Write a protein that binds this ligand. Structure first.
Ligand code: HEM
Ligand code: HEM
Ligand code: HEM
Lengths: 157, 157, 157, 157, 157, 157, 157
């Protein structure tokens, strides 16, 4: 079903945001696992999977709308080298992506692509959940100190 | 454990190959799905997942060896626009990757990184399985004709 | 609860669209069944049932909103005499109905009837699924030819 | 128990026929498998296993009768390069083997080796089943054409 | 996938080794069974089956590599007439085959056919197991004497 | 089956490395248990058992190859007096043993003892896992401090 | 709890006896296994494991009593080269160990280390069981002759 060209361009931009997040979260996860921080591996792995599911939704929607999914352009990763830096980078990436979601959701409403909007609102809800988790963890590092915080990550939860 | 720098370089080059294949296979899968070719969606999706698993193994091994996984550089995709083209493109990608694996496996032996070699041989076995499947499907297109071939993809197997 | 009069007019228009679709899909289903095309009977039967469920939702919502559901006016059916024509007629009907759904969803937002809107967005998502299936089937007829296409319908899936 | 020398010669001749068939059917099976013709691999594999069971019966009977089983001489295989040729070669081999079975069954009756005869009649019944299947398949190739025939082999039955 | 011509010649040579062993083990097994030496029938039958599985692997690999499996040219059997002579012949055949495996495994590495090498290493492990069993049984004949040794074979283990 | 003398000597050297590690890990485990560090008792106990399984494999392989396993010479243990010292000693012992494994693995290939090599590669994989664990724990002591680290060991995981 | 220095010296001597026995029984077991004498492998393996459990008890007790377990000094093994010599060597080792146990049990009583004494009396019971088994087997070799004795070891019991 022929979709709106700019809606497809927004879907591709959002897809690109997910592609960056998949890679950044997955590498973060495996860094935490190498360091023995099992709890952080588990959460960041599942966030990577979430972003993969989002990417799939965008790819499927773009194809339905007769557009061309762009998996070729990968944007900048910001990996980081210690736990706080890694989490802050993930939070900044989520916030940037949420701004883009909000813009796309408004635009899709304007051109009456309500099913693409609906999909994007569900994805935004997921991202806000990730934002909550990241903000909270960052606060916990400050409140308990890094040594206690790292100890709290060695066992699965 | 401090690994061999050139082994790490190979692992990153192979990881790069997997990152391309993940995306190419996944987009191909969803293109087949959109077209109603369920059988091809199913196989290509699982090939994409296989390559994700390979990428994980490389990431984990690089980190163990105290190197930096590179998920930033994505090489060229070649998507294609019809089934035969798509399958031929996946086949050429697999064969390029197998050349690289053979080189890496010889080198790892020469510096006595036998565990990285062992890992890579298992991956190469996986890749040769993918090559067999692709070669066989391409021959089937020719033997039964494209119309019959497409009809044979519409149901799951 | 007294609803907005023009919301109710929209719900009655959409109900009208569903009533035409119920009958057109049902007759198509039983025509496919008569012809021995079991798979098309099954899909088209279940699309008819989907539209019945949508009609029920409209009737209940109209009554809640203190309007009068109109099941008396039936619009034009376009049955068709061969498989491709029948599927094309269903696709045209779905696309006309989607246009009407988009206008209703917009209008309901403007008068703050957000629950009628939510209902309608779910229904639109359903109809876009039907659109995807019909488009895909029509393309399959072309790609594999009508003889192979009809062979592919004789068994249930 | 000392058997009749010419009965033993017949059993060795028939064993020889089975040894050729085991190898010819097995290679055919794996050729079909390589080509993605799963249904033909399955049938031809099980025909190979049937001939292995027949060879075992001959070897055991010869030993009981105090003769020397000959597994050293292997007769001519005729592999073939396409499906029809391969099936025709199997059919010719089966028909040559049936002729030999008929002569052996007659001869065993004449010297009152009724248990060897009973064994051979069971084996002949098996081979006539294989003949029926091969004849039927070859006729199906002609009736539906080779493209449809090959399409019909790609899934297991 | 086109393989290296000399790798395929090695695989055919090894296949040839397996074809001889299949027949020699199977006849030995049934000779033991005729003699009432159940335990030796059981072991030798299962060794024959192992070699059948090895032959299958070679056939499938050769076909993948676009070579022609040779099941036509059966090498010399050495059956033997008493238990010790039979086991010694089996051992000599295993040792000859192991020499050939070692040569092939080195060559496959040199031309970077690492998957054919991996397969052959697994088969070599199997053959060394057979060698261990044979060497051990031959020593047991001498340690307990042949009358006790034969006694020890009449019941299954 | 007579093996290569130098391979047997390598296998005995490697066996010697395992015998030291069995004792060192076992004593470390029970020291951790005495101290109430249950998590460290559990891991180091299971590492000792791993090395016992490795020693068994070497003893079995050496005997198959007609050599004499040497369990008489025990090398130097370095026990240590506090958790970090104990773990660093285990790490140094593992790294020393890995060097010896790599040398033996290359030599076994050179003389075509591919089964001994396969065995040793599996053992090396196990050793690299122990190395990862030890490295990681040592880094965790530094990251969370010794007091928190010790607190993290008192409960089983 | 601060133990008596001389009790700890005895525990270390007994531990040393166990370490010799672990290695001697284990190697004996695997020699028997190599020879196909499965019953002897099974018994001698489990005796090795018994002595491992004894060693563990001594190590734990020594640590409780604030002594230093000595796993560094390994005493003389006497392996031997045929079944009778191997069992006689095991028996002589057991008898030597029982003398030391008796001395230690008396001493521990005299200094009121009744829990160490209780532990040692249980271990002595175990050793007298091993002594019974060994004496009995040696008598059986003589009574039935070595050829029959060896025959009786080839199956598990
Ligand atoms: C660094 C790159 C990636 C890695 C390491 C990775 C890793 C994984 C892993 C470990 C799984 C679970 C597979 C299993 O254990 O069966 C998975 C599944 C999956 N992947 Fe990826 N992936 C990557 C990129 C992608 C991309 C680019 C996409 C497509 C946009 C994608 C889509 C999916 C989906 C949809 C699943 C199934 C998730 C589910 O269980 O619902 N992945 N991936
Ligand atoms: C090309 C050479 C041969 C190949 C590749 C072959 C292959 C096989 C395979 C793959 C199996 C099943 C193995 C399993 O998964 O358990 C099998 C079973 C068997 N083979 Fe063979 N075989 C060959 C020759 C022979 C010959 C010459 C004999 C007789 C002398 C024989 C006797 C048997 C028997 C009796 C069975 C068990 C059948 C049953 O399931 O009842 N095979 N063979
Ligand atoms: C030649 C040296 C040794 C060898 C080859 C050896 C071998 C083994 C093997 C194969 C097992 C069974 C592992 C499994 O599969 O679960 C085992 C268990 C065990 N070993 Fe050892 N071991 C050796 C020395 C020792 C020593 C020196 C100790 C303590 C000082 C020890 C303590 C134990 C214990 C406590 C178990 C568990 C027994 C149970 O099941 O209760 N071993 N050993």
């Amino acid at each position: 079903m022929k979709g709106d060209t700019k809606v497809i361009n927004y879907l591709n931009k959002l897809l690109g945001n997910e592609l960056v997040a998949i890679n950044q979260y997955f590498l973060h996860a495996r860094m935490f696992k190498n360091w023995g921080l099992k709890r952080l591996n588990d959460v960041e792995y599942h966030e990577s999977i979430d972003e993969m599911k989002h990417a799939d939704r965008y790819i499927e929607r773009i194809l339905f709308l007769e557009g061309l999914p762009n998996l070729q352009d990968l944007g900048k990763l910001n990996i980081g080298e210690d736990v706080e830096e890694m989490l802050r980078s993930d939070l900044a990436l989520e916030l940037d992506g949420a701004k883009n979601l909000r813009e796309a959701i408004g635009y899709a409403d304007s051109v009456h692509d309500y099913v693409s909007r609906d999909m994007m609102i569900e994805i935004l809800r997921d991202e806000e959940g990730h934002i909550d988790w990241l903000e909270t963890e960052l606060d916990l590092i400050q409140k308990m100190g890094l040594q206690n915080y790292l100890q709290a990550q060695i066992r699965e939860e």
